[PDB]
Symmetry: D3
Subunit: 160 residues, 6 copies
């Protein structure tokens, strides 16, 4: 069913934390990570969504080769990382590239190897460890179904 555009803010392997300014469209170097970690996958947000906090819904995209910040990728959801940090709840849709048969075998979170999900989860739990006031409290994984529903709501919030 569902598919959308993700705007990659941060390439796999990067320790610079880029972000897109959501009115001006410009890309911004928010900060350099305080921990010796790097983004586990290409990271961004779903174009035309609105989360709880006036921010578009976050997205992880699985790619063979990282992209550049600002790049659009047409993607589809396979699961969702649920996380509660110091600004409270925050979710990240796990995605593969849409209409690329090389990802056809990846249909739900069951299809992504554990060592990969754990590596991703390990990054978000620890990446802000050396940043005062900043912490993480929940962190877990849910299936394409819950991913799809959270997307749907954020699309509807974006239209209101």
């Amino acid at each position: 069913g569902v598919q959308f555009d993700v705007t990659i803010e941060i390439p796999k392997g990067q320790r610079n934390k880029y972000e897109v300014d959501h009115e001006t469209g410009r890309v911004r170097l928010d900060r350099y990570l305080y921990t010796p970690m790097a983004y586990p996958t290409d990271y961004g947000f779903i174009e035309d969504t609105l989360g709880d906090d006036g921010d578009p819904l976050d997205a992880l995209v699985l790619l063979p080769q990282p992209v550049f910040p600002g790049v659009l990728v047409a993607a589809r959801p396979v699961g969702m990382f649920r996380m509660v940090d110091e600004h409270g709840g925050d979710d990240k849709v796990l995605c593969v590239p849409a209409g690329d048969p090389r990802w056809d075998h990846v249909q739900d979170i069951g299809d992504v190897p554990a060592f990969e999900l754990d590596a991703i989860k390990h990054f978000f739990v620890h990446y802000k460890d050396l940043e005062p006031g900043k912490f993480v409290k929940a962190a877990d994984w849910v299936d394409r179904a819950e991913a799809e529903a959270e997307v749907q709501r954020s699309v509807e919030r974006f239209k209101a």
Copy 2:
């Protein structure tokens, strides 16, 4: 005589197929090539041209060091790659950087070494070999004169 601006969509050496969306201005990861090949030169399109198919005229730009997708380069034509694929005819203007005396010795397609033209041609002939329905039929090289004429028409089509 003629010179124009090229928007590089894809850097030399890249296997990610970026493209510029021509209304929104945004850059897009179209697909990752199915063959183990990589763009033989920096690749883009001539700004303010319109081809037969509502798409700006394609350009190859010879550069010492690859640029980033979206980067403008002022360029001049030295020849043109004529190719007929599954969507029919499609041409690619061969360029060097404008007003850069290091390229002064390159004035027509005679001035580009054969092994380079062949490498470029070999890329377009084979890059879509593992992509169903997609094939290539003609593929040859023509001089700065024919390049200049096709540009001129595409500039005039862009003004209508």
Copy 3:
């Protein structure tokens, strides 16, 4: 006191000379340097400033990891490189990242090691050596004080 946004045009380590077109917002490959040199730090301009010559005030930003052309970084001044070239006077504010405590020990030009200031100065003195008509005549360093003053003036020129 003072702090501002810098738009990085050229990453540390690059030999391609990118520049932002100031009306269109687009990024441009101006030229590939003629000397075997690479920008000693990330290089751009202070957003919303206007110099003597209708061009925004130049900026050097010290970063742990280079950014991409077009990226915004919030920054604060610690000194200024004064230089007179073939188009006359031209200054470059030395900046560190704003609100990043890892840079708290850098408060004025005294706090940047000499070998670094000399490396930067060596780049601007020599980078145009193989470029006809282009030369450099003055080149020296001044403190956060004078930096702050030149910024203020350029901000005020931008509002007129």
Copy 4:
């Protein structure tokens, strides 16, 4: 059952064709490829084997991140690429990393997606297209079983 050491000569993504000199141990830049292609996976030879032609048996290793020429990787076979070129028969064992549970799901050639095998095969069929006298005639895939047997013989040839 079987597992061995591979010495990577050429990293995934490289167009430089490095080779190890088999007496001196030194690494050598044989040639830069004439086609705009790059090695589809990390490429080398199985340490302590001897093929038909006094050369150690060739190996492709599947890795998450490319290595450096000269690097040893402990590996296990999953299949074999059979190829007949201008020097006649030549085979390449397809391998994954030994004792790394992240590759446990890859047990025979059935387990490697078609688009990957085809990409590899496409590289070896075309990489020497622009090299006079050099051609390719057979090229196909066989299973872990045949891979294992060819290894065994090359190990025994190495002991004679």
Copy 5:
């Protein structure tokens, strides 16, 4: 006083865990880290030392630009990272480049900024978190004096 040669096994920024085999001299891809982390500095061992476990003493080397695995760097000690893992005690001498005046200001562990020591410590505490049976228990910092003493013993063990 003391200075020695370090063989860098692993460049800053790498997630591949290279190691030197200490008889054969050859470099080996041990494993790819299970956590989304990357070596916080260039990492290796002190040439001609012998630790408690028949392995040369580990070293961290602070460098402006990462080297290649196998590269020798002449270095001097400024402190030492004391850590107890699953194989028991294991120490890591913190070094700067020898005879390089750019590092003259770094004379003991007091001279290395806290955010750097913490980043390094954070790496060794967490890098093996997703690796069964592997854990970390102590982890702290000591001064150039203790570094110098542990080196001295390992040099003497190497001569017996």
Copy 6:
């Protein structure tokens, strides 16, 4: 006529100054350059030569893509850079790859564009500018002829 092996110590684009230790065969990080410069071509020495100073004759090799330190390349001379520094005379043979027809049009120093020879010369004249006691006094270009002669002598010194 003449052709030989070059051992590349330093890749084009690098600022780390690698060097091969000539007895042990090991590669060494000598220093990071003090100026914001990077080696204009791949740089090494002619294998089995001996200069005036017990050091093998230096070599520049022109390549499409840089190699790794320690890599051998079979090469042929097209000219020589003569230079006198603080340790007196020091020469560097300009080479292209042997038996590669893509370089057949480069037969003597006349065949290398001026902007290239000047770039190379500019690097050796300035790269040590910020290094106390270190300077450069002569620096010029001579033809394949003189190159061939200096090689011959160094080969003969190597055999004595």
